């Protein structure tokens, strides 16, 4: 199953991309912001996954509680700190996004969070080899980050071939989705 990550460079365009992805037939739509209020707007537009990215951990943990009370179906939390990710999960986050800079640290955090009881661990890399190591370590969601667009296609190909069940990547633009819809085309299941 694919997760489309909204990637527009401003909130108005990001909110429109949610609508375009939903119409195109994306099964899961993820939206990241440092603003709780912006994440509520993305959910109201039809996003499935609200990614908490606020810098201040006190503020970020309160956003999890606010989004849960609000009825967010899936709340993700992005941190370089496995201690912070544990606090986010205790506060009601569904998905811990491992963001640690050093790959050795990031893989140990996957193993730590699995043993802590994390239900859904996500891991991000430009490297197919690193995502396979993370999946083996117990990650549930593989986030493709390949720099240029041709690299991103190969990484998704690599993960499909591997049998990754939850593949996340940056979405096509609204203008691309709208052109496909104008032609009568929709997302096809893989």
CATH number, domain at 63?
Answer: 3.20.20.70
Residue 188 inside a domain? The answer is no
The encoded tokens of residue 64 equal 């999890």
Q: DSSP assignment of 79-96, as one string? A: ES-HHHHHHHHHHT-SEE
Residue 189 inside a domain? The answer is no
Q: What is the resolution of this structure in A?
A: 1.5
Residue 58 inside a domain? The answer is yes
Would residue 86 be called left, alpha or beta, if left means φ above 0 and alpha means ψ between -120 and 50 degrees?
alpha
Show the domain range for 138. 2-182
Q: How far apart are CA 164 and CA 108, in angstroms?
A: 20
Q: How far apart are CA 28 and CA 12, in angstroms?
A: 20
CB 94 within 8 A of CB 120: yes
Residue 190 inside a domain? The answer is no
Q: Residue with structure tokens 């899961």?
A: 28
Closest CA relative to residue 40, chosen from 62, 66, 7, 9: 66
Q: How far apart are CA 118 and CA 110, in angstroms?
A: 9
Which 3 state secondary structure label does DSSP give 43?
Answer: helix
CB 100 within 8 A of CB 110: no
Burial class of residue 97 in the structure, from the number of CB atoms within 10 Å of its CB (0-12 exposed, 13-18 middle, 19+ buried) = buried
- Backbone phi, then psi, for 89, in 5-degree steps? -60, -45
Method used experimentally: X-ray
Residue 125 inside a domain? The answer is yes
Residue 38 inside a domain? The answer is yes
Q: How far apart are CA 60 and CA 56, in angstroms?
A: 6
Residue 164 inside a domain? The answer is yes
Which 3 state secondary structure label does DSSP give 35?
Answer: coil
CA dihedral of 126, 127, 132, 136, whole degrees rounded to 10: -80
Count up the domains in the chain and report the number.
Answer: 1
């Amino acid at each position: 199953m694919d997760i489309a990550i909204v990637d527009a460079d401003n909130p108005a365009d990001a909110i429109q991309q949610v609508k375009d992805l939903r119409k195109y037939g994306a099964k899961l739509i993820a939206y990241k912001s440092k603003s709780s209020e912006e994440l509520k707007l993305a959910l109201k537009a039809g996003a499935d996954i609200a990614i908490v990215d606020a810098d201040n951990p006190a503020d970020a943990i309160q956003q999890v509680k606010d989004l849960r009370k609000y009825g967010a179906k899936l709340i993700a939390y992005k941190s370089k700190s496995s201690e912070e990710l544990k606090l986010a999960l205790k506060a009601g986050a569904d998905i811990a996004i491992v963001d640690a800079d050093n790959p050795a640290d990031a893989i140990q955090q996957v193993k730590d969070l699995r043993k802590y009881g994390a239900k859904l661990i996500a891991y991000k890399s430009k490297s197919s080899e690193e995502l396979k190591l993370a999946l083996k370590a117990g990650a549930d969601i593989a986030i493709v980050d390949a720099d240029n667009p041709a690299d991103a296609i190969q990484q998704v190909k690599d993960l499909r071939k591997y049998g990754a069940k939850l593949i996340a990547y940056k979405s096509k633009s609204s203008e691309e989705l709208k052109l496909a819809l104008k032609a009568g085309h929709h997302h096809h299941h893989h």
